């Protein structure tokens, strides 16, 4: 559908921001790592998780 | 003289060490020894110390181009010049007071 495609595009769009938001948060050193993980490892986990939540 | 001996730097004679481009040296070889091989002249300009080298007109037909020299430091080193004659006597001729590089032009 035409509107389903608009709705899909806007699903990726919001997930794209959610990711930038965690990136800006990580660049500003405010991110707090999960016990037994790099600050970076913790970040990549989140990014990867949002992007998949999105694809689905 | 005393064999195997070195000669006289004690006199504190000073000399300059100059780096020249290969092409220029090539030109210099051309000058006749009989002539005394006068290659050209060195210019010392004031208003700041500037030294340049210019080839003699005989050397090339054109307007002589000055080759600027970049003065450099002795560096943490002492450079001395020693000569060996056909006789194979060795003499400690002088110490290098100043170093310079003649830039290509």
């Amino acid at each position: 559908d035409g509107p389903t495609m608009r709705e899909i595009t806007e699903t990726i769009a919001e997930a794209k921001k959610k990711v930038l938001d965690v990136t800006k948060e990580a660049q500003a050193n405010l991110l707090t790592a999960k016990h037994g993980m790099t600050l970076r490892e913790s970040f990549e986990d989140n990014v990867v998780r949002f992007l998949n939540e999105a694809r689905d | 003289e005393e064999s195997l001996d070195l000669d006289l730097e004690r006199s504190n004679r000073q000399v300059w060490l100059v780096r020249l481009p290969m092409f220029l040296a090539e030109k210099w070889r051309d000058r006749n020894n009989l002539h005394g091989q006068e290659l050209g002249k060195i210019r010392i300009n004031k208003d700041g110390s500037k030294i340049t080298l210019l080839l003699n007109e005989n050397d090339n037909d054109s307007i002589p181009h000055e080759y600027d020299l970049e003065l450099t430091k002795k560096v943490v080193e002492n450079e001395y010049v020693f000569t060996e004659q056909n006789l194979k006597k060795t003499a400690i001729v002088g110490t290098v007071c100043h170093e310079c590089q003649v830039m290509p032009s």
Binding site: - | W16, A25, Q37, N78, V81
Partner: protein
């Protein structure tokens, strides 16, 4: 431009072809760390001998010895410029440049024994 200023220019005798040591003008270079002082009552004497060829430089015994090795070449080359009483300059090409190249010394009754001790280490 116009030269309101004055320049002192000296004639350069591009290298005289015929010189007694036309053939050899060499550079002997010492590292400042070596701290060699030519004006030494001790360094009044000096001998320079080819070692059979690195050059060997030695003062009277009890004084340091230096070895001279030849440096690698390049496109540019060095000339020694000397000035006559008359301002004229005579230039001579450097035959070879040597980095000296001396002793220490305090290397006697050792070296071979130290390595052996080092071996008594492994």
């Amino acid at each position: 431009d116009e030269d309101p200023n004055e320049y002192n220019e000296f004639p350069l005798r591009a290298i005289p072809k015929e010189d007694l040591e036309n053939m050899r003008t060499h550079l002997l270079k010492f590292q400042s760390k070596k701290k060699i002082n030519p004006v030494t009552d001790f360094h009044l004497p000096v001998r320079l001998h080819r070692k059979d060829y690195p050059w060997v430089m030695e003062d009277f015994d009890g004084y340091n010895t230096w070895v001279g090795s030849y440096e690698a070449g390049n496109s540019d080359s060095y000339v020694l410029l000397s000035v006559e009483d008359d301002g004229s300059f005579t230039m001579i090409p450097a035959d070879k440049v040597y980095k000296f190249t001396a002793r220490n010394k305090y290397a006697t009754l050792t070296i071979d024994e130290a390595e052996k001790r080092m071996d008594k280490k492994s």
